[PDB]
Design a protein around this ligand. Structure first.
Ligand SMILES: Cc1cc2nc3c(=O)[nH]c(=O)nc-3n(C[C@H](O)[C@H](O)[C@H](O)COP(=O)(O)OP(=O)(O)OC[C@H]3O[C@@H](n4cnc5c(N)ncnc54)[C@H](O)[C@@H]3O)c2cc1C
Ligand SMILES: Cc1cc2nc3c(=O)[nH]c(=O)nc-3n(C[C@H](O)[C@H](O)[C@H](O)COP(=O)(O)OP(=O)(O)OC[C@H]3O[C@@H](n4cnc5c(N)ncnc54)[C@H](O)[C@@H]3O)c2cc1C
Ligand SMILES: Cc1cc2nc3c(=O)[nH]c(=O)nc-3n(C[C@H](O)[C@H](O)[C@H](O)COP(=O)(O)OP(=O)(O)OC[C@H]3O[C@@H](n4cnc5c(N)ncnc54)[C@H](O)[C@@H]3O)c2cc1C
Lengths: 394, 394, 394, 394
């Protein structure tokens, strides 16, 4: 009733997000003790609806590791996407051009899959914990937390992996002198709505117009997920279903294509930045996923990045826990950040190409249209774009 | 007034640069009399030594028109180039990737050939003229000039072609209300030197380093042409052959590749900006070449753009003087500017990828290395680059 | 690395222009360590022949700061100007309309005063330095420079202020992503001559004619300062003194007014554009004067703007160094940019009203004359013009 | 060939529009016979809905000439206006600044007044006539026309005056060699709507915003007239009343100011350009009103200019027909065109200050706000604006 209980694990994992839970499960199947603490309820996580686009590799990781094959049953495979600009829609054919596809499967469903998998396998994931602090980072680290029932624990592990997300608490514990932050902020955001309607397109539509950028994308057959470019500080309450659909028509509708429209069942404005914390390992803290980086949503590279991170980190942990090798853990930061910059650059290129530069810089708008034309008009261009989108298989 | 002699031509051409002379010669070979006025001496023009990289199409135009095949004899065909960064040199194999090559031939040599060809055919080309004005652009145009020996003349033409280059006089005579000017100015320039030594590589090497960008390019076997990135207002006299070679060393040298060095025989600071005047026809003035647009030198598209300009303009002029159709003349601006923005986009991409972002932009520089990696690492990437470099063949 | 002598000050000043030197003297008189570095010799600066038109307030700053009262002795106070169009000259009476005057006094004399004053008091002004570099701007800044005798120094300051002029080195060192450049380029320039002759009128004459614009201005009693509108790349080499005086005659003379004339003792062609770099503070580098903006000469607002910048910046610096308050520095860009755009708008209006629209816009010329009549015909109009001319007294 | 009945007048007036009828009545009360031919039915003319902004002078001409004093009772006098930009509304106080007002009184009401006045006083206004031809203009002119009932007439008079409006037939009969035309077209138009609602402001609100320009105007107390800036080719059909009012809120609403609204009862888009036909007298045909010029709606200066034209035309006719002097008739064109150019410039300046320049010229937008600030903050500026707005009292 006053005991701060000591409990032991091999890996302390902070975050019941996709990256944390995926790492938890791979550690489980390689036989390494992991305890995962999260500050939100399972329900909070499941009611937070982020759409998702999974690269070939992320879908393979979910599957070949046994986490959950429901992605293959309930998530739709797409062989391409379309760029809409100047009234024309062009098709980037992933399969014809690079022979890979992507799978559209909501990220919350990945969460549900992974959390259920861990529970069914009796994994140790504590939700709704509080008073979270981290200690002895370069030693044998220790995590202080008060679990959901009010009980206090000191968890002691060999390493901590902080998968706290972009509001990371673990990464706030690193001394500034031993880290470096890379930032780049944008003057626009996405206004994202979930609306009840049939497919207005089969594939994703990225569209660029004088009035802004807009993405026509799908989540359910009943509900579709749509985004359009907006001011960073817009209040959804000052928005009518009519006004939302008007913005969408002005950017997408016309020239022999009409956008199906429905009731606006949720709306939310979603800001974003490029962020990179390097190196991704400090002492025995490893950072993974959005705790360590973030990207503009355009590329769909975020959750792919996180899953990738946990995979490379896990390979390091297994090498170490099987043979005592430190070579892979030391190479974790290099391997991860390498991909992180590739993704940063690609998501940046996509953002630049598709969003109309806020405020009408005319040479800028001209150059942007020039680029869009060259990309859709060159087979090498479409192939390079598809390679980046579908996960750089090579 | 005293008499300024009144003379007629069908096309009065302002500028004895390569675009002006090439149009003059093409109008000649189709039997259309064109008179060329220039404000510099033939000698002034020839002492300006700018290197040149000619796309296949430019070489075909120079040859199949009879202008000069000396491009084939004295100019070297290159089949690729190299992007150097982080000590490694990667090679874009143009012929392997897109099946085109390019020809390295000094731009002043092209001027020499074309000027000689005009003289040899008796073409009217008057150098060192002054008092140059342009009048009645929407009427039957008129060019006033005071030729070399002091005679004042009024030339009357059916059309004026302004090929004045970036110090163009003609584009200033087009009313501001009826045109649009497009800008983008860079925070660096090029320091260009000619030094006597053999080629330190076979092909051109574009290198990007912490200290800046540098281009290793060839002019003679005796003389090599080098450039390195510099501040827009750098003064060449505050630099020694030693200091210049230092900048080149710190940017290019390393990892088993050494830069040969020689006596520094010329040094000059060479500014540049991206500019586009649209539309490229006003009344009966047609603008071409640096009169209507300019590029960063990185992409090598400037003289190529000029030749493309004059080629499309000649086809319009021929259509009209043979069959009276204005369709080709009316579509000149569209055709020309379509290609011009293509080049604008590509030259911007090359520039931003290789020049080091001034000021310790950390995200900027990190993403730059990411992009350079994605491009040299992907065959589609190198293919897209090669396609554009060589002139968008297919 | 041979130790570069390291020296510290509180404010590093880049530029020995009037704005820079005046900043130095204001910092000195409030007792703040200010060190000024320059790349030109004092004699080179002095051979720079620029006339000047001082707003009332600028003359007040020159005196009430102790910089130099020589302005009042050797520079003459003017109570108005005359607008010449349609062969008629109308007079704007500054004192009658807004009750302020302006003081015509060569800008080089202001440089002389400020150079002499800093030198005669403790002089921290280093001429003819080279190897100018800027570092760690968002931190505690550093300036590297190689002074005139070859000494290398690393200077460390709390703030850097860029008064480099339009050939600024500082504005090229601020990351492109954190700045914006504003442009507007004109289709004309000024051909400026200094000629020995008596004053042809009382005040400056702004004259507008079918043949172009011309400004008759005063510098000495012996020498008058004259400008006429010309093509941006006009070369004086192709110009005789007779032809110059013909241009002035066709632009100004008539209806019983003839311009007195003399030997053309200097001639030079003078380019200009409207340019604005915002924000005017990045980190602890502050930009001022032609380093941060430029305007067309028609309105006479350039050096006035520079001095205004330095005054507001000095006030921020003093507030901070006296109470540790940052507020005045933080709003520096705001105040400066407000006044700067006001000057920008005024100078654009003056230029657009007075120069003859290149290319025979008939509607443009008619609208121009309509405006000029409506302006000189309305008392409110002349008062608005005078208010802006004299510096917005109120 | 059938004989056309021969009829006599002194002044042939073509157009029973405001200017034609006003000339008719001035001629009547001065005892000069006026005969008026019109191509529309009386109901046709009266159904034309132009809002109206009458200068001081138009109100004086309407009242003191006896046309109809109904304007003072039934037209509302406005003593200022409000410039809304950057969410701020500044007020131009016409009465405070120049001591004149303007009267908002629909132009349709002025037509009714003038038509009723001519009919009751004995007047020749022949509506719904056709088969218009005009002959022997530089002599004693002759006009052929067919009234609505089929009667054929040749009317023969001393002078013809054309008030046909901007689709004028008379100005198309003038030899191009004997005239000059001035044109200039703008890239936008006005979206004008008539909607039932109470006053959202007392005075007119001109508002300038990112999303466009918008004018809040009155016709009734019951019905309001509104405009917003849009593409010259936009169809009211593809518009919902909800969508329209959205455009208006995005342009005007904010900072605690909301636009009252009701359902939209008429909508129509209004193209506009600047035009001037000179000289306005060719032979013994005189031109007035929109037959001879056109303006941007921004100033409301069209009907005012027309009335001024007819006033000077009548005064010329009076000098000649009473004392036989041609001095007033010969100089009519000069005076009319002088004021016309004044109004052209004023309408131009208002538009450039208020319309957001389509396509994002960034320096342009900055200069625009600079102008707006300098004008609203200066008493001379607001006074000059008010002077021109209210009619150039003097
Ligand atoms: C196609 C596609 C589209 C995308 N669109 C968007 C978009 O529109 N907007 C956007 O912002 N991102 C977007 N992303 C990125 C995606 O939303 C992120 O990956 C997401 O935040 C999940 O994070 P993670 O598991 O990948 O990284 P992790 O670092 O594992 O983050 C998991 C999430 O769990 C939460 N969490 C974990 N541990 C804790 C803890 N201890 N305390 C509190 N919270 C915790 C975090 O808030 C975090 O967001 C997109 C990605 C893809 C592939
Ligand atoms: C460092 C550098 C590297 C480059 N590398 C390449 C490369 O690899 N490939 C490539 O294709 N290009 C290259 N360029 C060329 C560059 O892109 C230029 O834009 C290109 O040369 C086009 O200019 P021009 O000589 O055709 O001028 P033009 O448009 O062809 O005409 C210029 C001529 O006009 C004359 N003229 C000026 N004013 C008047 C007047 N009033 N009346 C009459 N005549 C007048 C001038 O005297 C001059 O001779 C390079 C340039 C530089 C500086
Ligand atoms: C009525 C009127 C008329 C005007 N007419 C003109 C006109 O005709 N032409 C014109 O150009 N301006 C004109 N001006 C504007 C005036 O020249 C500028 O506003 C003024 O130069 C701004 O002050 P500054 O100190 O930035 O100028 P500057 O004189 O440019 O001072 C900057 C100094 O910094 C030095 N410097 C440059 N680079 C470096 C470096 N890297 N390190 C160290 N020092 C460096 C330069 O040598 C220079 O001496 C006019 C202004 C007014 C009010």
């Amino acid at each position: 009733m006053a005991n701060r209980k000591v409990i032991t694990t091999q890996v302390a994992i902070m975050g019941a997000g996709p990256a944390g839970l995926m790492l938890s499960h791979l550690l489980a199947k390689a036989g390494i003790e992991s305890t995962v603490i999260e500050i939100r309820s399972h329900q909070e996580i499941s009611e937070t609806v982020r759409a998702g686009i999974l690269e070939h590799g992320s879908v393979n990781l979910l599957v070949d590791s046994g986490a959950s094959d429901r992605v293959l049953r309930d998530g739709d495979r797409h062989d391409g996407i379309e760029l809409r600009f100047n009234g024309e829609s062009h098709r980037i054919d992933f399969q014809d051009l690079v022979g890979e596809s992507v799978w559209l499967y909501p990220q919350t469903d990945v969460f549900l899959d992974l959390a259920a998998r861990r529970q069914a396998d009796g994994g140790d994931v504590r939700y709704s914990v509080t008073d979270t602090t981290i200690h002895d980072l370069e030693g044998k680290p220790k995590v202080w937390f008060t679990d959901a029932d009010g009980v206090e624990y000191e968890l002691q592990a060999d390493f901590i992996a902080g998968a706290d997300g972009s509001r990371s608490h673990s990464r706030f514990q690193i001394p500034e002198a031993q880290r470096k932050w890379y930032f780049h902020e944008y003057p626009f955001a996405w206004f994202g709505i979930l609306a009840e309607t049939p497919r207005s397109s089969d594939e994703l539509i990225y569209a660029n117009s004088e009035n802004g950028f807009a993405l026509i994308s799908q989540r359910t057959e009943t509900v579709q997920r749509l985004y359009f470019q907006c001011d960073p500080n817009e209040d959804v309450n000052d928005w009518s279903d009519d006004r939302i659909w008007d913005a969408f028509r002005s950017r997408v509708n016309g020239n022999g294509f009409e956008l199906k429209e429905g009731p606006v069942i949720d709306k939310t404005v979603l800001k974003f930045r490029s962020f990179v914390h390097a190196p991704m390992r400090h002492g025995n803290l490893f950072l993974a996923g959005d705790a360590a980086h973030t990207v503009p949503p355009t590329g769909a590279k975020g959750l792919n990045l996180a899953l990738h991170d946990v995979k490379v980190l896990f390979e390091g942990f297994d090498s170490f826990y099987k043979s005592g090798s430190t070579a892979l853990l030391d190479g974790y930061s290099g391997r991860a950040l390498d991909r992180v910059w590739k993704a940063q650059q690609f998501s940046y290129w996509m953002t630049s190409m598709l969003h109309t530069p806020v405020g009408g810089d005319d040479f800028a708008r001209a150059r942007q249209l020039g680029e869009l034309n060259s990309v859709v008009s060159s087979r090498h261009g479409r192939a390079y774009l598809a390679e980046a989108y579908t996960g750089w298989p090579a």
